[PDB]
């Protein structure tokens, strides 16, 4: 199995999963044309999307894929269905893609109806989960968002986190506007300075790993408490992390 990442736009990543045969998985395309070239190089043969949400840089791309590979099946949530989705899923429901058993999970937040999907190790979390930080609250209460990436850190330590956004490098220097002497955050911030300076794609990224350096998997940590309730005399933990996507949005 590879694991593939074809830039689009500014910021955004299309993943793509292929099978030893190059049967294919296609995650989030809001660009058609950079997928296409793709397979075409590589000589894969689409079998499904995913999809994680509606919004445009991540469906955009659907229409002219299916035109072009009219067997392709379109997975997403129900937000998505006029985006081009041809099997809707929910929460606890399963897509089966390339031999494999994806698991759908819930993760109201960015949106309302995001979902991920989960086939051991692989987790598309969309714009979620980020490697140090999590999405922007467009649709979503702090609360959910915090429950959803509550669901994300259960799964297993060796889970790799497929999102869909290169905010890492943006996302570690918030972490150290909040926690600037912590060694942890510190060294890792400068690995992701050193591969962008170069240009270079910072994921995917290992769960254990998140969970030393994202401050939004942190919330019940002493030391984040203390840093936030000296600003905020905060006392539940949805609130604190409502804080900390607060200040992120004007940081
Ligand atoms: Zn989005
Ligand atoms: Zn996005």
């Known amino acids: 199995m590879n694991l593939n990442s074809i830039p689009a736009f500014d910021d955004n990543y299309i993943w793509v999963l292929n099978d030893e045969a190059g049967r294919c998985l296609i995650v989030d395309p809001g660009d058609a044309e950079p997928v296409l070239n793709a397979i075409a190089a590589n000589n894969w043969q689409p079998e499904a999307i995913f999809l ?9 791309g659907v229409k002219e894929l299916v ?32 031999g494999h058993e994806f698991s759908v999970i819930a993760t109201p937040g960015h949106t309302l109806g ?35 990436l509550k669901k994300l850190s ?19 220097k918030f972490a150290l506007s909040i ?24 994921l995917p990224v290992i ?3 998140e ?3 994202n401050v939004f998997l942190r919330t019940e940590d002493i030391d984040l408490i203390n840093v936030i309730n000296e600003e905020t005399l905060l006392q539940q933990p949805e609130e604190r992390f409502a804080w900390l996507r607060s200040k992120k949005d004007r940081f």
Do not use: W
């Open 211 to 213: 969970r030393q350096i």
């Open 114 to 148: 995001h979902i991920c999907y989960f086939s051991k190790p692989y987790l598309f979390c969309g714009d979620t989960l980020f490697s140090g930080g999590c999405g922007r609250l467009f649709e979503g209460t702090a609360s959910q968002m915090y429950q959803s």
């Open 179 to 202: 926690l600037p002497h912590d060694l942890s955050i510190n060294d890792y911030y400068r690995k992701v300075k050193e591969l962008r300076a170069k240009n270079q794609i910072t």
């Open 154 to 172: 259960a799964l297993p330590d060796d889970t790799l986190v497929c999102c869909a956004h290169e905010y890492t490098l943006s996302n570690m």
């Open 67 to 98: 035109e072009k590979f009219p067997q392709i099946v379109v997975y997403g949530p129900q937000e998505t269905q006029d985006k081009g989705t041809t099997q809707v899923v929910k929460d606890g429901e399963t897509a089966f893609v390339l």
């Open 207 to 209: 769960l254990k790993n």
């Open 52 to 60: 994680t949400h509606h919004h445009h840089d991540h469906v955009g």
